[PDB]
Amino acid sequence: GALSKEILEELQLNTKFTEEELSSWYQSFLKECPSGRITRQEFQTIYSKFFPEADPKAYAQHVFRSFDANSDGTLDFKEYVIALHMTSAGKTNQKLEWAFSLYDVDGNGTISKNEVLEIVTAIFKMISPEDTKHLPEDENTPEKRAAKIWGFFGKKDDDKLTEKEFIEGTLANKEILRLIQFEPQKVKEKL
Numbered sequence: 001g002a003l004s005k006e007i008l009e010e011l012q013l014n015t016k017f018t019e020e021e022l023s024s025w026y027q028s029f030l031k032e033c034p035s036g037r038i039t040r041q042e043f044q045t046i047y048s049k050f051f052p053e054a055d056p057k058a059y060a061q062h063v064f065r066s067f068d069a070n071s072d073g074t075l076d077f078k079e080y081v082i083a084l085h086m087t088s089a090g091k092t093n094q095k096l097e098w099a100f101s102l103y104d105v106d107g108n109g110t111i112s113k114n115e116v117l118e119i120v121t122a123i124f125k126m127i128s129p130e131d132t133k134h135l136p137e138d139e140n141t142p143e144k145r146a147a148k149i150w151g152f153f154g155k156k157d158d159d160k161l162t163e164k165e166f167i168e169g170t171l172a173n174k175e176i177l178r179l180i181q182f183e184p185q186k187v188k189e190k191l
């Protein structure tokens with residue numbers, strides 16, 4: 001019952017985890033989750049446990065949605081590993097399509113102004129109140145951060161932000177990168 005070659009290959013292209021590491025992790029995953037599927041509540045519990053200083057429910061729910069790629073209401077091992085990797089490992093620039101999916105809350109193919117606010121707020125809640133005191137003054141509340149992102153993209157209130165533009169802007173404008181950042185440790189390291 002080893003993890004398949006096909007899934008191993010995909011995971012190794014999309015993360016830097018090794019085959020040995022992934023295969024070992026998967027065997028324990030199955031022992032603890034014998035259906036090979038994690039529910040949203042179970043995923044939330046992981047983030048509740050490992051961010052005790054934060055309020056991670058909203059963030060974990062958005063991450064779950066983003067990585068439940070077949071929309072079946074559970075994460076399989078592949079989806080779960082990619083989700084954990086998104087929040088906690090690897091380089092931002094290799095994740096920008098997933099970042100787009102995170103920000104496109106309703107999945108309609110574009111990001112709206114309110115979606116930016118929703119996701120920025122969920123991310124902001126991953127930071128301890130103590131660490132927020134060290135954010136730049138003009139970037140120290142979700143409202144300021146979200147408004148600034150929208151302004152950096154040059155958008156009218158009812159405009160729709162495409163993935164093409166999202167990726168361009170996050171690559172080119174390092175201030176956009178800073179503000180859209182979704183890995184809690186990177187938001188912290190930056191401040």
Ligand SMILES: [Ca+2]
Nearest residue numbers: 068072074075
């Ligand atoms: Ca799924």
Ligand SMILES: [Ca+2]
Nearest residue numbers: 104106108110
């Ligand atoms: Ca949308």
